[PDB]
């Protein structure tokens, strides 16, 4: 039941993570890419969770870029 329950936005998050992995010259799809893929989907329920917690798009990108190499 891996792909039998994912919604349309769930696959969009995975596609965003996959396309961000190529640009960052990373051969491994780590957990740091799924976070970026989720942040670029302001339509899901999780979008309201981060919006209400003063979590924007530009801050998380630089915060995760600093941690990773």
């Amino acid at each position: 039941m891996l792909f039998g329950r994912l919604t349309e936005r769930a696959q969009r998050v995975l596609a965003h993570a996959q396309e961000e992995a190529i640009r960052l010259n990373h051969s491994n799809i780590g957990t740091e890419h799924l976070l970026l893929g989720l942040m670029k989907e302001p339509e899901g329920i999780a979008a309201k969770v981060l919006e209400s917690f003063n979590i924007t798009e530009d801050k998380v990108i630089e915060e995760v870029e600093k941690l990773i190499g």
């Binding site: 039941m1 329950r5 329920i45 999780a46 309201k48 969770v49 209400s52």
Partner: protein, 52 residues
Amino acid sequence: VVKALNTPTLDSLARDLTVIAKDGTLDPVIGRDKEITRVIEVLSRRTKNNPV
């Protein structure tokens, strides 16, 4: 996220397998397709339809 969001006799006297398998918790049975097909072919018959 929370705030922003039938034959009952046999059910209690035994355990139901397809209910748990529906939730997607059991390990996927891989490589037993031949046995599954043999069992379903044997089971679908008027006589001698109880595979062992």
